Design a protein around this ligand. Structure first.
Ligand SMILES: [Ca+2]
Ligand SMILES: [Ca+2]
Ligand SMILES: [Ca+2]
Ligand SMILES: [Ca+2]
Ligand SMILES: [Ca+2]
Ligand SMILES: [Ca+2]
Lengths: 213, 213
């Protein structure tokens, strides 16, 4: 059977609303006046009335901007009923596919991460790992893809940047010699996550690294 | 049966082309890979290839700006065939409705119309009738609706405008006294037709009126 294709709708639309998506039509409007309706979540169940159909034209309508992070897919049914009150078609499925916009900054799992490392480990040594997530799509886009960076380190002793961070994994490492617990026993690193694998929104957190004895 | 609604497409589109109109879809792409095609005038008969369908996505495409005055309606069929070569749906009808833009100026039937009238008829007297047509729509719009006016008269004797014209019918009348064959035996009137019932494009012609004795 010939059916309506999934309808792709990007989130956060300007409208104007209501917005025509597609026009349902039964063949039998030849012999009969037809009344179209729609059921399902987003229509007649929660959230009600996000989608509506014009009773006589069969225009399916979107009534407000969508949010993919709330609902990414609606599955509705279209109905066709004659003036005399008889269902004249089996209900048809209709799918609405909400597509992504980069509308989330990344978020660090904690605001402050704590880890530690021994003085005198070789440069190259893994210290700890940080994590930030991103609500947006990261399959088809870089909207959800986070890149990690270190913005600054305190104090600047012995040298000004002793650590680096692995840009996709969040793993912090020692890249320098001179960690000495007795002179600088702890460090605070401002760390950053930027979605669009680097090119996007930036979020900030702290990593506090203890120098073990 | 649920079918594709007529697709309204205004003429003279900017594109970009090719332009997605609507997405055909068979249910049976569940169990089977489907190949979509389209037949009919505008597809596989003259004018070929104004419309095309993407073999696998089933996107129906318009490939160039349309002209309503050339063809105002296309009637095509959609086809669905399995990978193994079997038609798996009865062909479906598809209608394309080309809608109007005001892209024609009105045109006078002749460049010079000739008529005559007796001297000394009462003011109010019908002299002749002019006609201009307009290719555009005039049912739903004023694109096709012409309004007539007189731009000027030569000579300006006795008085400067002796005639008027009925704005919707093109009928010219005498609105003044003093027509005297012996002093001014003929007049030339520049006449105008403007579509959008007055507000639109203007075309010009001539009416030559003989004064009878
Ligand atoms: Ca969102
Ligand atoms: Ca998003
Ligand atoms: Ca994001
Ligand atoms: Ca045209
Ligand atoms: Ca036109
Ligand atoms: Ca016109």
């Amino acid at each position: 059977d010939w059916v309506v294709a999934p309808i792709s709708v990007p989130e956060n639309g300007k409208g104007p609303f209501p917005q025509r998506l597609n026009q349902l039509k039964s063949n039998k409007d030849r012999d009969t006046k037809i009344f179209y309706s729609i059921t399902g979540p987003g229509a007649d169940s929660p959230p009600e009335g996000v989608f509506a159909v014009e009773k006589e034209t069969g225009w399916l309508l979107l009534n407000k901007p969508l949010d993919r992070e709330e609902i990414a897919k609606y599955e509705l049914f279209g109905h066709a009923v004659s003036e005399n009150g008889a269902s004249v078609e089996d209900p048809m499925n209709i799918s609405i596919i909400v597509t992504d916009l980069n509308d989330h900054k990344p978020k660090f799992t904690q605001d402050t991460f704590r880890g530690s490392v021994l003085e005198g480990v070789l440069p190259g040594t893994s210290v700890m790992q940080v994590t930030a997530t991103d609500e947006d799509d990261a399959i088809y886009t870089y909207n959800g893809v986070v890149a990690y960076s270190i913005h600054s380190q305190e104090p600047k002793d012995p040298h000004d940047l002793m650590f680096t961070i692995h840009r996709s994994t969040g793993t912090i490492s020692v890249i320098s010699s001179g960690l000495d617990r007795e002179k600088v026993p702890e460090y605070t690193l401002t760390i950053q996550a930027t979605d669009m694998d680097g090119d996007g929104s930036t979020t900030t957190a702290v990593a506090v690294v203890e120098i073990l004895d």
